[PDB]
Symmetry: C3
Subunit: 115 residues, 3 copies
Amino acid sequence: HIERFEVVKRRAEMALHGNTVYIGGQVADDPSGDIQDQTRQILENIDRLLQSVGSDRGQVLSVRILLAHREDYAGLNQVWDQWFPEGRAPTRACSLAELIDPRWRVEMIVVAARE
Amino acid sequence: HIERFEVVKRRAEMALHGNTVYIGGQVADDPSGDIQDQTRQILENIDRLLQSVGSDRGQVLSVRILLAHREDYAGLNQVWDQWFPEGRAPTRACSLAELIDPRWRVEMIVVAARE
Amino acid sequence: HIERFEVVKRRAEMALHGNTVYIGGQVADDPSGDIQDQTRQILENIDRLLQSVGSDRGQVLSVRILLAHREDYAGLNQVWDQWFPEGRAPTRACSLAELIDPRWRVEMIVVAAREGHHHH
């Protein structure tokens, strides 16, 4: 009784297992912009996915952040550090990575809870 | 007498915690072939591992795919995109990475359910 | 409800969801040391975090290991092999990665169980 969302042959965007939510690699739908813009797009899409299963921004457990360029780290954090409800930031791990599309400045992978 | 010198690797292959399955990084047993062959080997090993604990290919939650070479992306997907039952692909995040053994074309890290 | 530990705007060091423990990216507090030193520092901080919630190093489920330099692989594994009770080491996946601070030789990301009522 795994529930899946936005499913194609290649992937589900999201899978729910009991009360645990898995969200696969998230990138900006419009990767033409800067790190701040792409970060915001990804976080907003995460908001939308979470709301669709009865979760929310305060229920995130872990985020893996794959960052394309070191120079973008401050801009990533500018958006991220203002985002989560007070005292409810998830665990986080950010490193540099080579992503499939050279336009992507960042990719996130998420585990969350659903009450 | 005889003295034996070996390289011995004792791998934590899987850990089960209630109804969630964590699989250690998986690579091809025989990494001499192309991306298609290596991808097939790893997915087949995942079938065997999941079978052994009462899970299956339709119960995968997340797969992190670490691809060694950009040129192998299409070949990875050629196999992957035909693998999963309809509506049952896991969440996925693929990026390029330098792997421990230069022979490996891909490594996969799996979380699955056993219901 | 989720319980979080060592929380700032940027991150919680640890989040507990029922009996599953998530610990975020762990790097050495003092990164001037070699791979063995940094690996020990990281595993000790993981130990402290786990025990604070009633888990322990025999209850880890997965560790993602991001290694900065190929020549450090043997040193990482030397400590790893000295650390965990026989047969109870967690699943792992190690690859080479560029980390944010060039001084960091390794970074680990952890999922663990919190089973029993073990006091530390």
